Design a protein around this ligand. Sequence first.
Ligand SMILES: O=P(O)(O)OC[C@H](O)[C@@H](O)C(O)NO
Ligand SMILES: O=P(O)(O)OC[C@H](O)[C@@H](O)C(O)NO
Ligand SMILES: [Mg+2]
Ligand SMILES: [Mg+2]
Lengths: 215, 213
Amino acid sequence: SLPMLQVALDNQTMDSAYETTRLIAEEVDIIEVGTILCVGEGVRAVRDLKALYPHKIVLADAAIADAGKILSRMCFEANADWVTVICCADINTAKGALDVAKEFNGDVQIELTGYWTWEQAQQWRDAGIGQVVYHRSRDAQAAGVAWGEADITAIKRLSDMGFKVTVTGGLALEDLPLFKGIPIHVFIAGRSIRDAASPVEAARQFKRSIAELWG
Amino acid sequence: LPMLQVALDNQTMDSAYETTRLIAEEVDIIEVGTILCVGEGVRAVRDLKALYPHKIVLADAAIADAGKILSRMCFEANADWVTVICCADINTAKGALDVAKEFNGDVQIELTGYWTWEQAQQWRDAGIGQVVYHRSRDAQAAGVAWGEADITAIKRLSDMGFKVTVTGGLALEDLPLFKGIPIHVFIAGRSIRDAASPVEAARQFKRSIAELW
Ligand SMILES: O=P(O)(O)OC[C@H](O)[C@@H](O)C(O)NO
Ligand SMILES: O=P(O)(O)OC[C@H](O)[C@@H](O)C(O)NO
Ligand SMILES: [Mg+2]
Ligand SMILES: [Mg+2]
């Protein structure tokens, strides 16, 4: 299947977010309420975005660290389809969020970061987690960290374990061929779409490139 | 003496105010819980600091990435302190700290779930002076108790030079487990907010801390 495209709305206010969505809502598959938007506006951002775009998958990038059932329920009651749980959360946090996700016919992704282990990845699978987000951190990127070999190896191994893998972190169009040949579920682009001279054409470029590389 | 912090793990400001109108003057630190950060957003920090400008306000944002951006949003809303989750990239913690210094604030690393001693030394090397030793709410709900391994870890963190906050379903009766350790802050959320008498609950915590330290 072609990798899907997710836009990250890492905006501090809803109106800033809408400057993007009014252009590209129908140019992407998934609309993410970025952590920065969740923190800027609260869970109303999920409710309002889903109300505008009820046919789209809406992902709340809550990066849940604890209180899995409470935070997940807040997001799902606001009509989220998918929610994120940070990988260092206690395993009961992920399990809790998943339990609530199932109630709402939604799903949970584990957001990968820090010194996570392959034993922990197996724990997520045994818990029934089917999605992981492989993130090059914005702050690592800013400190000069590049996408490379070790990332491809890890992503392939996560996929082989049965996860649908999302890839993100300052992706540019030129980065996509690094991942060719791997059944990536979703690529997220935030800055590379929102900050482009033409967000519509940036999103279209990503779609064209994906269609060529995975066609 | 260890300070007393109340956690406002509420979904709306009006629910938080049900607690702060009783106990704001009975604690040292008012926490905007992660639940409140997600429920209302950074307006919660702004509003609570305006109400209680003489109290330390902690935004329990549990920052996982975009350290400079998220911490600036909290500090522009007049936070004193902000949390960064322990598995954040080291550059996220450094970024949040750099911004905190612009505002004469501080960053705490939230030790909830998995982390390593090597990471602890990294935080120290980066200039981080505060950690929050948590028993995860979800771990507690799964029957995990406070135990000697926690005490040993807290002492170790203190010995590395961190000011240590202790939290996670703390009851009054738990305080003596930590006796002898120079704890910076004890946090209570449920044990204060959900008490038949929140005022009595907060004062009992302060009374006990004063006895033990
Ligand atoms: O493409 P970016 O601007 O890096 O945004 C996507 C990224 O996944 C962010 O939403 C994020 O969650 N960073 O932690
Ligand atoms: O005393 P509690 O109800 O456990 O609340 C304090 C705790 O520190 C929470 O604010 C929290 O951050 N749990 O992850
Ligand atoms: Mg995101
Ligand atoms: Mg908290």
